[PDB]
């Protein structure tokens, strides 16, 4: 008999590794394997939340047009998350991925002006560059330093064609005039499972510096950096596919022997 503690621990490892768009299938597998529904829902609650925040799961709030991202930066507590664009908080159930109880939320800080300007520029960026992107921008004082945190998400779930994919990017602008330090990570995950099974997992770290001026002008510098870095990453991914087939793939198995003919199996046996 596996201990309840170990059932929960192992269930959480599986849940937190569900590919994008496949949480429900993984959860249902794990639920049938544990055969203890209350243990799974209560003991693995941290895992469901961990998953949504790691995945930048977008959620629609009733009465507001644009969806907000579930992230560690918006995690308030008591299962509530901040929508910093609409200046509200909302309850979020991580299992059903449904928001509720939108209550007004004061965000009156010395950074609201910068966050709002970065958020306005980012929203345009995301609408121009992604098919169905969402983004959320936070303003926070991390260790006495003003930090803008921009989060972007975009997914395409196509189970009827046996594939799912998600893009996530997370940009951190540390404001220390007259400069700003830029740290970013870009992430892609793709699962295609018609013929057999393949997953693509990729990330890129970005470090940069920019000159800070006005809230509005620095917002345009911030977005230009994002756009260049994200265009370049995506192009390099697309081109590294070609490179992998010429170097690494041929490094595992050749297409044909060096003779450029299939094997003479009678010569082999003699």
């Amino acid at each position: 008999r596996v201990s309840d503690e170990e059932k929960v621990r192992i269930a959480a490892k599986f849940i937190t590794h569900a590919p994008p768009g496949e949480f429900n299938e993984v959860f249902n597998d794990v639920r049938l394997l544990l055969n203890n529904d209350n243990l799974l829902r209560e003991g693995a609650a941290h895992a469901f939340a961990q998953y949504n925040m790691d995945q930048f799961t977008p959620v629609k709030i009733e009465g507001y047009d644009d969806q907000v991202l579930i992230t560690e930066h918006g995690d308030l507590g008591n299962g509530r998350f901040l929508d910093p664009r609409n200046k509200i908080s909302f309850k979020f159930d991580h299992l059903r991925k449904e928001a509720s109880d939108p209550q007004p939320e004061d965000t009156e800080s010395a950074l609201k002006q910068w966050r709002d300007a970065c958020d306005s520029a980012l929203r345009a960026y995301v609408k121009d560059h992604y098919p169905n992107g969402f983004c959320t921008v936070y303003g926070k004082s991390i260790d006495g330093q003003q930090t803008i945190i921009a989060c972007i998400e975009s997914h395409q779930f196509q189970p009827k064609n046996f594939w799912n994919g998600r893009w996530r990017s997370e940009w951190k602008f540390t404001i220390t005039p007259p400069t700003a330090q830029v740290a970013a990570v870009l992430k892609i995950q793709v699962h295609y499972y018609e013929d057999g099974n393949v997953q693509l997992v990729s990330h890129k770290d970005i470090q940069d510096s920019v000159q800070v001026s006005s809230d509005v002008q620095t917002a345009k510098e911030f977005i230009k950096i994002i756009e260049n870095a994200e265009n370049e990453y995506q192009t390099a991914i697309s081109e590294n596919y070609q490179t992998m087939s010429d170097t690494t793939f041929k490094a595992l198995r050749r297409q044909l022997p060096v003779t450029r003919t299939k094997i003479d199996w009678n010569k082999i046996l003699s």
Partner: protein, 234 residues
Amino acid sequence: DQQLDCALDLMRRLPPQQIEKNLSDLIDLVPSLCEDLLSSVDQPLKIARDKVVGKDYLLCDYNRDGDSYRSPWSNKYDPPLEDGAMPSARLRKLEVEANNAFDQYRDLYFEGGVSSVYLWDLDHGFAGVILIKKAGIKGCWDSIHVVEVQEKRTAHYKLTSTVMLWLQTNKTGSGTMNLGGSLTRQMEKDETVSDSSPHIANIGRLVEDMENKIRSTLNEIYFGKTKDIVNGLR
């Protein structure tokens, strides 16, 4: 069994490079599934050393007896066994010839790596596994080919094959890129068996064709389908 179906579905969705960890965690979680899961899920190949001959060989359930594994080179178990399961004398002769032939096949197509062949007698023929492992340039290719031979002259060959492949690059432009996964395929054929077209030649050709077909299919699935998906995410 509902739980077995669920565990198998989990293994198809979890990241493919973590098969050993995912398999071991699943067996921890439902120990009664252990035997069924290990017979249904392909494990990456492990290398052992035949210290008598001084040659590497590959480990799998087909060359296991108890806790020991049989070398295709020395035909001995490690740790030693008094009466380990052995191929018949006739089939051991074929098994030696098959190990030599696939060593060469491996050198010509993989230019490295390790291969092993184990054969076992059946009622009206025989069966075998052909294992190839080539590590990278980070990555690894594991192929497992299970062949069944019914001798009627002319024989009927049935081949079930799984290739497991992962590759990772770390580059200035594309960051870290990891592609991992697998493909299983099956082929059947009747072939003439003669001194000039012996079983090992018929089997090698069938394995050769399968690996070339699988490589080509993976190339489009890896370097084509996931590529197109990335380019539509943004």
